[PDB]
Amino acid sequence: RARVLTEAPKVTFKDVAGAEEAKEELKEIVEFLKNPSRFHEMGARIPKGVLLVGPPGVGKTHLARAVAGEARVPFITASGSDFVEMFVGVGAARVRDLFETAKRHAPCIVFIDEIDAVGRKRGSGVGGGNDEREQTLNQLLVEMDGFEKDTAIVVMAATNRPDILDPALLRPGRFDRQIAIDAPDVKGREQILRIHARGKPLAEDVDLALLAKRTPGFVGADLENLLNEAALLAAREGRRKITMKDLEEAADRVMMLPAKKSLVLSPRDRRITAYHEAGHALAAHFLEHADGVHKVTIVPRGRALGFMMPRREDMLHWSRKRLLDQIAVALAGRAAEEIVFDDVTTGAENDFRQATELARRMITEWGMHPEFGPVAYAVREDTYLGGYDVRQYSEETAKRIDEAVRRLIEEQYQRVKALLLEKREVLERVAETLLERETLTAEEFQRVVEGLPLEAPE
Template identity: 45%
Template sequence: MNITWPNFNRNQLILAASGAIVIILLLFALLRDSGNVVTLDQATKLIENNQIEKAFSDGDFTYFATKENGVVKIASSQLPASLTSHLVIEPKGGNGWGWFFLFFALIGGAGYWAWKSKLGFEDDTPIESPVVKAPTEAEAPSTNVTPVKSTVRFSDIGGIGDVKEELEEIIDFLRNPKRYYSFGARMPRGVLLVGPPGVGKTMIAKAVAAEADVPFFYQSGASFVQIYVGMGAKRVSELFNAAKKNAPAIIFIDEIDAVGKKRGGERNDEREGTLNQLLTEMDGFEDTSGIVVIAATNNIDVMDAALLRAGRFDRRIFVELPTATEREAILNKYLRAIPHELSISDVAKMTVGFNGASLAALVNEAALLCMRQNEIQVKIEHFLAVKDKVMFGKKKIAMLSDEQRRYQVRYQAGKIFAATWFDLPYEKITLTNDAITPPTAEPQLCHEIEAHVRVHLAGIAASHLRFGEHASNASHDLSVAKDLVHAMVYEYGMGSTVLPKAEDETKLTDRLYQEMSALLERHEKIVSKFESILDEYEQISKSLAKATMNEIL
């Protein structure tokens, strides 16, 4: 038998809710223990002053009904028998739980009767379960895409001089688009900010919107991945349509790799549909639309090639961990409102590997420690005391001790020498990071791939020449070198024979390592000079490295 489930109107729901509230209040008044707890001294005074009108006990507590203070209670174990020997203490009555169960039994019976009469069926009639429909695309939740007005300025962000220069052109375009149109030039449609977590990619995008004084549309890549089929693509379309209505505008997609991963392998139709819609939208708006898409990612290697090609995200800006000078600028921003007596440059030198977020946490922890110690100014001692606390709370940030720093300087100096010697493309190499472009040109010549392998082995070779060992930070370089050698032997036929042999990988890797080690040993003077520069400035540009090498050779 098909039945119609009852639909309660608004008045019935309000009446039911009101009744529930009244029941809860009545039960609270009925069941709550209203006696105020008193101390033994207070109870003694009440008894000695003849303030007790009635006394009763429930075993755990003894209650006194007083003339002026109402009902008070004290733990029975605290009362000496001599104090209450002249009082008649009666057992306390029931606590109301019987009324509680009776009350709810009546309410439950009335509710069941009302529900049954509303349904209108006989006792022996089986109830058919209602069919629950899965939500369709039309029923899926819709989004209301609205822009925000960014209040973050470049002046609020320290240590981003290089990034700021790259983005000033975008800001000028959004302010004066006609200047570029009349010259026949077009701005990049997409700007991809690449860097580790915590370096301020989101703040940089907000600063661009604020400096250009345009609407800012923020979305995270994860927000496009929906459980409803087609909903992710719909959200992408809504986002771009809203931006077009508010042009000139900036669309910022944070963690874009969540939706822009390489296609193939494990199939995800919903994510691929969303990515296809994003690609279509970025191709769909004209060069004169006044829309710039800025995206951020921690891992550019996993992104789909179609998203990175020219005409989409054709400008990439790498936001690296700050150097000592940049950390000093960031610390100046965070400390300007905090009373302090310290050398900010000293704090900057002791925070190798800290990003902007961890520097903010360090300053805040130092300020809190200063307040706990009731001091009026933050000192270097406060930073030294909380550094470990911040360090171990930031898992993916490499913090270097003095000994680790010496190893890291030597390791990176070896890589700088190799990358400069073989003239591989890079802008700068820092103490904690390097951006050496992997070989991508086709066809790749054998000596070009070998040069890249040598660079990835150079840090290990340089460390062994100086210290006789190397650190675990070589794992990434060693993994890249192994992948390149494997491809040379098994994919490109560049081993001892065209057909691959298992021992060819070991022989090729050993030969390239020995050659790199001998080259570094012959030019130890250049490597040592790179160490000195890296130790002082924590970065070396390619132009400086070439000039230094040419000066010594």
């Protein structure tokens, strides 16, 4: 059993705001539900599964539903959690019979939420994390490969950390689709703030616009529970209409609730994350011999891994030189704040990991000619049921690797300190602009860097 939406769902792409970089890219999954009789017999093939990735409450389930109602298709939902909570066995059963439930509705959309809770295996938690994930997952993995021609289905997956998933789900036949959603956009914020002000009236003066800029960082489900709260301000005393001075307080109420010990995205938390994101920007960008790419924004959650992972599962000769600057742009994030900032450091880590991983690879798995040779002290596997890293050198050669990666990262970090330092004027320039406007497209960047404005025709 699961959550069935029969008769006909509401919620469609008209009830979904912004999400362009997703909507149009999903329109082909939709038309398969509409007419699978013009896909099976033509010659092409359809995903059968699509994982969309993003923060908590970005529009994910929202778009998942939206695809069902648009394609006028039954909506099947089940949060991953429910499949592992049980003993060793019933994990497998619940999946098969969810898919003998979804099979009966041809077509339909199945939608597992936090599939996060079924994908991963390595050798870490030996005891009670092995056989319950070994089994349960390798059922969906087999039921999905059960979708041949004349069975129209779309298994949609939600997840807040995409990288923590077993490399077999993104592999052929199974979940072979990549759309993440950076939804808290400017114009998006408006549209979301508009769409969720249909019920309840407002005798306003701000036009929700001056609320968008006063809630720059903010997700839609964040947004909704902002307004819905704003109204209950009135219904708490019985007031006709709610002002925009009743709306600021509605953002000063949700600013201190996400957790248990109350926390926020303060004028110094943006101001940090900004210098930090300018660092990377201002790093990967050079002239004569430097190496990297470009497109700058604030608030992604996932995406900032791109400078390795979604590329090692896409094979090609990278380069010692390339990687080092890669490792440089890695530490840029830190560097930045080390410099500008209050000479204390914010725990903003992943970067270091990416750098460090990139650099034990440096030494061991690749042959990059340290003091360690072109010898192969490791063996990242990439198998059909298995396929993840383990490896043998020997305690000593381990210190040997350790010391080495300290040396490598330290020294490379110092690099990106200088270059940030040396370019210090531009940091303020970028970060400041960044703070102020959230997003710069890279040619826009190209300008702000060469001390020049570029205003929006707004």
